[PDB]
Amino acid sequence: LPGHLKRILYSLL
Incomplete structure (x- = not known):
């Protein structure tokens, strides 16, 4: 899906 x-x-945040 688009996102x-x-x-x-x-992953980073």
Whole structure:
């Protein structure tokens, strides 16, 4: 689904 920016930004945070 459209929302991987948050999926990867989540990785760092």
